Design a protein around this ligand. Structure first.
Ligand SMILES: [Zn+2]
Lengths: 64, 330, 122, 119, 173, 103
């Protein structure tokens, strides 16, 4: 669906790091060091951006 | 003969000394029976690296039982304000109602607690001394100067994304004590709440309450409030002659100096790579000091982390004065 | 109050290979009494090595207020639980002791009775 | 009922608070403490590599292929934890949440794909 | 049809209600020869067994088995608190048996230490296998506590271990 | 009605009581257990949560002599409150020194 605004394990505010993350992947930035630019140190808050799929831009198409 | 009840020692298969083991009549010769002025002298707090939304102070000289209070108290017993009841009006978003109302819950709120009080009864109306209302009115259309492209910032973007900037503050009552950015909606103004397509609305009031973190984790004032004992690494044998730079890449990078000197042990993450070497694993015992830990508080942003810790100690003291006045009744 | 004492020479630090990280089972021999004993010793607190003369005293009682028998430097506490040249099996929680041989000097022992060790290096 | 992408399904027996749970050094308290007795009788060693291939995966910003009869081997995943300062088997030193003292043994630790299912 | 009555299956006479999985690997790791608890951890593991018909007993920690250089308990001495927590408890359990990975030679004195000897509900030697705690063996303690000392003491000592052994294992990891 | 004592026997024994502290958990128990175990006249202290469903711990104190199972408990809190008074002041004196050094 949409990005969950917390990490599930720690609860770092991670919902505000999606379009800032997608803005990084639009540039040259590799999948790895894009999350090091956003200040995601531990891996549990790193999987909330890495393993996330964004269905909400795809569902919107079928929702006039 | 020599007593390391003061270092946990990390083997290759287990962690050896672990429990505190320093109480009256455990270690003969040693009187350890809580001399108050002995604790008062051997204890200090060394603060390292406090910017906004972090803190890495030390607290050298307490047992790991009281230290596990301050980690735990920070995690789930320091109160904060968060959205609890989302009074929903017309909401035609594709995001479901509760999942919207749950995602409004996890947004942190910069209004500090201990200005407010708890919610006594059910009391769904609020009393402007308990609550803090927010409004969210987003209705997106097409902009008229949109080009023929399918770029969602360009076309269809009157308010395609409901950020937390769109939340505003309905001062409930006098609310003149707090200033204009005083209740800065969500501490982070970039949090994406939901997405919309033109013709869709989100209209909802919110209610914020003062909640313990153990009631629900959206009230948690801190991202992580963990701690870790300061490691100290002792080379039993002098290491030199290219085995030093072998031992350099074995540890964490900043920890070591090159002969081999253990320059700065505090930066060591416990990879435990020595035991893969089969030669240096007999050379150096790795250990962590028991009464010297490293706290690492990183707030979400409700209260600054130097006021989270001084509130965390303040409610443990209040938890024991709550019980000491029970014995005074009885 | 002493049940039994002599000087012992530990000969095999662990006879069948190290099985535990904190307890190694010693094999010793007495001085002129020839009492074999098979004693487990917590070696993290009290490390022992091969060929080390050490005293050993078995006492029913130790007599901080009554000023205990503390000239020795390793004291356990356990009960005798089997008497099988007599063997005399003592258990110290889990740490076994199989003091053996020449039943005339073993006379102080019984079954189901509390027994202290008081060891000391030399 | 949760399953675990290896047929080791399990009803969620207890829901502890977060502060009662064995955080590691970097702060990560777990989500789903799994019992280690599901392993030595079922012999699902493929689960034990997902906690390794996942944990090296998130730390590098990469999705590790574990396919059938191939995929990312352990001898190259394990030397990716070392670059990020982790144990080369994944067993991370935790300290217990309840008592505050460190745990006597290291604890395996990582992200594995838990799918909730319709029971 | 109570559980305190049907502890024993009618095919063999074996007990079916006994420890499973973690409790067995909890109590084996506790009664293993290497563990030593100080009065810090010893009164913490023991005081887990004080809720629910057990909160009204003066729980007697046994005197420690090391005194002089550091004083600390052993693991098996804390497992004896399961069989006899109070002072006025009338249970005296007795059991002598082989175990898994048996040493083959030597009765109880070999370093492998797989030979259980309980005297008067005090674990004197050996470690608690499945065959001394689990289901299917006619010489586990919960079967021995059943026949010799009624069935209330077997169900109590089984409901003591289920409370005690995870509290050790979750702090031993 | 938070703390409540549990008499060992109908006759009444003051050498061993069982404090039931309502609405709490290891956050206090494990920090009060430590500060009451450092008393030289307590032979047994320990706590247990009755159940994760309810919220209470069962501290049990057993002294040596004739300690009324309440005087270490009323000194377990008083030593802990004197700690949390001191560790707070050493904290706030150190943040105030760290911030000024950054200026
Ligand atoms: Zn996290």
């Amino acid at each position: 669906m949409i990005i969950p605004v917390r990490c599930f394990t720690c609860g770092k505010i991670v919902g505000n790091k999606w379009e800032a993350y997608l803005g990084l992947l639009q540039a040259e930035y590799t999948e790895g060091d894009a999350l090091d630019a956003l200040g995601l140190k531990r891996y549990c808050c790193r999987r909330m951006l890495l393993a996330h799929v964004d269905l909400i831009e795809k569902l919107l198409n079928y929702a006039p | 003969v020599e007593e390391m009840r003061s270092r946990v020692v990390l083997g290759e298969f287990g962690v050896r000394n672990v429990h505190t083991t320093d109480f009256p009549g455990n270690y003969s010769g040693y009187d350890d029976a809580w001399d108050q002025d002995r604790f008062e002298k051997n204890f200090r707090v060394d603060v390292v690296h406090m910017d906004e939304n972090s803190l890495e102070f030390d607290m050298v000289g307490i047992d790991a039982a009281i230290a596990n209070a301050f980690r735990r108290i920070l995690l789930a017993e320091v109160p904060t304000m968060a959205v609890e009841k989302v009074l929903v009006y017309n909401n035609t978003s594709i995001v479901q109602d509760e999942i919207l109302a749950h995602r409004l819950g996890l947004i942190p709120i910069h209004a500090d607690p201990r200005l407010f009080e708890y919610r006594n009864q059910g009391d769904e109306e609020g009393t402007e001394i308990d609550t803090l209302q927010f409004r969210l009115q987003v209705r997106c259309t097409r902009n008229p100067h949109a080009a023929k492209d399918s770029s969602d910032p360009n076309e269809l973007y009157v308010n395609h994304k409901v950020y937390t900037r769109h939340m505003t503050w309905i001062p409930l009552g006098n609310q003149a004590d707090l200033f204009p950015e005083g209740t800065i909606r969500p501490v982070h103004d970039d949090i994406l709440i939901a997405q919309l397509r033109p013709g869709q609305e989100i209209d909802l009031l919110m209610h914020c309450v003062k909640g313990i973190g153990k009631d629900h984790a959206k009230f948690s004032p801190v991202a992580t409030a963990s701690y870790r004992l300061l490691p100290d690494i002792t080379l039993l044998e002098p290491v030199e002659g290219e085995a030093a730079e072998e031992l350099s890449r074995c540890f964490s990078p900043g920890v070591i100096e090159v002969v081999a000197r253990v320059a700065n042990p505090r930066l060591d993450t416990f990879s435990r790579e020595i035991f893969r070497n089969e030669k240096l694993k007999k050379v150096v015992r790795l250990a962590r000091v028991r009464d010297h830990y490293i706290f690492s508080v990183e707030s979400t942003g409700v209260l600054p982390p130097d006021v989270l810790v001084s509130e965390a100690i303040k409610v443990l003291m209040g938890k024991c004065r709550r019980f000491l006045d029970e014995l005074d009744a009885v | 109050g002493i049940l039994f004492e002599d000087i012992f020479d530990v000969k095999d630090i662990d006879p069948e290979g190290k099985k535990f990280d904190r307890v190694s089972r010693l094999h010793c021999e007495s001085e002129s009494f020839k009492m074999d004993l098979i004693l487990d010793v917590n070696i993290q607190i009290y490390p022992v090595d091969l060929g080390d003369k050490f005293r050993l005293v078995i006492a029913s009682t130790l007599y901080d207020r009554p000023s205990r028998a503390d000239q020795f430097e390793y004291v356990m506490y356990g009960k005798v639980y089997r008497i099988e040249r007599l063997s005399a099996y003592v258990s110290y929680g889990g740490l076994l002791m199989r003091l053996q041989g020449d039943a005339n000097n073993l006379h102080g022992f019984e079954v189901d009775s509390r027994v202290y060790l008081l060891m000391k290096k030399l | 009922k949760f399953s675990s992408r290896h047929g080791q399904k399990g009803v969620c027996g207890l829901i502890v608070p977060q502060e009662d749970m064995p955080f590691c050094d970097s702060g990560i308290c777990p989500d789903i403490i799994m019992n280690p007795h599901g392993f030595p009788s079922r012999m699902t060693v493929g689960k034990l590599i997902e906690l390794l291939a996942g944990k090296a995966g998130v730390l590098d910003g990469r999705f590790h292929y574990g396919t059938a009869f191939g995929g990312s081997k352990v001898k190259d995943v394990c030397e990716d934890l070392v670059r990020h300062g982790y144990n080369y088997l994944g067993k991370d030193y935790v300290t217990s949440g309840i008592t505050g003292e460190p745990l006597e043994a290291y604890i395996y630790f990582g992200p594995v794909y838990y799918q909730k299912l319709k029971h | 049809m109570g559980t305190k009555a049907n502890l024993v299956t009618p095919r063999n006479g074996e007990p079916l209600i006994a420890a499973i999985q973690d409790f067995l690997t909890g109590a084996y790791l506790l009664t293993l020869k290497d563990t030593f608890f100080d009065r810090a951890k010893a009164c913490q593991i023991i005081a887990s067994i004080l809720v629910g018909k057990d909160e009204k007993i003066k729980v007697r920690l046994p005197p420690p088995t090391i005194l002089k250089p550091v004083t600390l308990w052993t693991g098996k001495q804390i497992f004896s608190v399961i069989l006899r927590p109070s002072d006025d408890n009338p249970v005296r359990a007795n059991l002598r048996t082989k175990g898994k990975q048996y040493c083959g030679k030597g009765e109880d004195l070999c370093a492998n230490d797989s030979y259980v000897t309980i005297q008067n509900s005090e674990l004197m030697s050996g470690s608690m296998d499945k065959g001394t705690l689990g289901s299917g063996s006619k010489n586990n303690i919960f079967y021995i506590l059943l026949r010799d000392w009624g069935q209330n003491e077997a169900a109590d000592a089984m409901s003591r271990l289920a409370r005690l052994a995870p509290v050790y294992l979750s702090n031993r990891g | 009605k938070t703390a409540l004592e549990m008499v060992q026997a109908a006759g009444t024994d003051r050498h061993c009581v069982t404090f039931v502290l309502h609405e709490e958990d290891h956050t206090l128990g494990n920090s009060l257990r430590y500060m009451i175990m450092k008393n030289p006249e307590v032979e047994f202290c320990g706590y247990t949560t009755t159940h994760p469903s309810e919220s209470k711990i069962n501290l049990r104190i057993q002294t040596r002599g004739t300690l009324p199972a309440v005087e270490p408990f009323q000194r377990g809190l008083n030593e802990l409150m004197n700690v949390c008074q001191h560790v707070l002041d050493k904290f706030e004196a150190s943040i105030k020194d760290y911030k000024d050094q950054k200026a």
